[PDB]
Design a protein around this ligand. Sequence first.
Ligand SMILES: *C(=N)c1ncc(F)c(N(CCOc2ccccc2)Cc2ccc3c(c2)OCO3)n1
Length: 216
Amino acid sequence: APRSVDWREKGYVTPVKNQGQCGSCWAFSATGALEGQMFRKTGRLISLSEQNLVDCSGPQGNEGCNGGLMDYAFQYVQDNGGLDSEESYPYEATEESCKYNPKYSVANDTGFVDIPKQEKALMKAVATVGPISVAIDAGHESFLFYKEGIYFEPDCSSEDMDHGVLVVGYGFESTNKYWLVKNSWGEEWGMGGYVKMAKDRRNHCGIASAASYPTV
Ligand SMILES: *C(=N)c1ncc(F)c(N(CCOc2ccccc2)Cc2ccc3c(c2)OCO3)n1
């Protein structure tokens, strides 16, 4: 693979969003992966509606602001035949009745791929596909209060992840490998909304344990 990758530089990544006090990280991880895949397919980068996922993907297993899985979101978009734009269906940070309107659908998917559970497979996916949805163990104050540099937490689990985020690239410090992760905690958290998660450190915080992307 290339020694570093940053899909932001190629136009695949919308600005950092803020999930607020709703357990909708999964929805933001899923929209970020589908935003990348639709951009690779069409050349247009269009922010997608997490609210549509929060309100409408119960049949596929999601639980609104109580949590959900990116793969259940990709399954909803396939079963539904579409997903509305953020502009048509803006975020409210509370689960509400489903308001999906196919007129304003700007994305679709035909399933999803679960990446083998190892960092070399993750690297190959990020280099060949685009941004990849992943889950991490974010359940340490060291994560909550992360500001900059490479995130390493000696108590991180590779098995017990609790937060969905988006890997948009990977690289190494010029001073030590990292994954470049877009969070959904707004731009004031971490490095403009991003975190450098340790890479090639025994699948630190389980970043390669639940990685996937949608097919389009
Ligand atoms: C995100 N803000 C958030 N908040 C609460 C919460 F319970 C979760 N879950 C998803 C993030 O963690 C993972 C995603 C992918 C893989 C492994 C972990 C956990 C969760 C809660 C509720 C349901 C889930 C998952 O699926 C069935 O319903 N995220």
